[PDB]
Every structure is written in C-alpha cells, then in structure tokens.
Copies of this chain bind each other. A is one copy, B any other.
Amino acid sequence: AVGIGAVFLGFLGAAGSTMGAASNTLTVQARQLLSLGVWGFKQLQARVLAIERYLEVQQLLGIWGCSGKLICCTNVPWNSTWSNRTQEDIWNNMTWMEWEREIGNYTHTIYSLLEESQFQQEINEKDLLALD
C-alpha cells in the first residue's frame, strides 16, 4: 500500500481514526476555514457568519497564548476527575469526536483556568524584566 503524506487528505479526513493519528492532519482543516437581490442578502449573511465563527476561535487562542501556534503546551495540570483513562488508550483507542463528547461538561472550567494561568504568566514575567 502506497503512502499518503497526510497533506493530500480532504477536509474532515481522519475523523474516524485515532486521536494520535488525527493529530498529524491539523493543517488541512485550517485551510478550509474562511474559504440588492434575494441571493445577495443570503450570501452577504453567509460571509459575515464565516468571519464571526473564525474570529471566535482566534480570540480564545490569543488569550491562552497560542496566538499562532497550532500545537501549544500549557502550565495548567490535568485533573483526573475530568478524565480517568490512561494516555495509551486515549491516543490509540478512540476518535476525537468521542473525546469531546466525554469532556463536554468540563469545558467551561478548563477555559477559565487557561485565562487565569496565562494572565499570571504575564505579570510575573513583567516583574522579572524590571530588575535591570
């Protein structure tokens, strides 16, 4: 079987594959984002809708410090209550759709923690630069 480089895959590809395998196809999804008459109004309403949806994700990324980074590590630790399964069974035994379904309840708590943590990373860094 010949190999595909994963850059040639189509949109929403590798959705049914493992989370670890799907982590190598993040680029293709990002490309498709932001791709007088009755039709003009509906088309115009569509253009603004696409802009609003894209900007919503970027606004969250900027606050978390991953302004342009596709994959970014953070300092907040993971809580066992949110998920109890081991690393081996997460990246190699289920898909991304199931993972988001499982932790959809704790999404609000994690979002606030990233903002609080990253904001703390800025004020203490500023204090370090003032010693010169």
Contact = CB atoms under 8 A, between A and B. Distances in A.
Interface string A19-40: 0000110110011011010000
A51 interface: yes
Contact-size category for A: 35 or more
A45 interface: yes
Given A44-B48, A123-B24, A30 B63 contact: yes
A119 B27 contact: yes
Q: How many copies of the shown chain assemble into the complex?
A: 2
B63 A27 contact: yes
A36 B44 contact: no
24 contacts: A5-B116, A27-B63, A27-B116, A27-B119, A31-B63, A31-B115, A33-B59, A34-B55, A34-B59, A47-B52, A48-B48, A54-B55, A58-B62, A61-B68, A62-B68, A63-B68, A65-B68, A67-B68, A69-B122, A70-B118, A70-B122, A71-B122, A73-B126, A73-B129
Given A34-B56, A54-B59, 6 more contacts: A27-B63, A63-B70, A65-B68, A70-B122, A71-B122, A71-B126
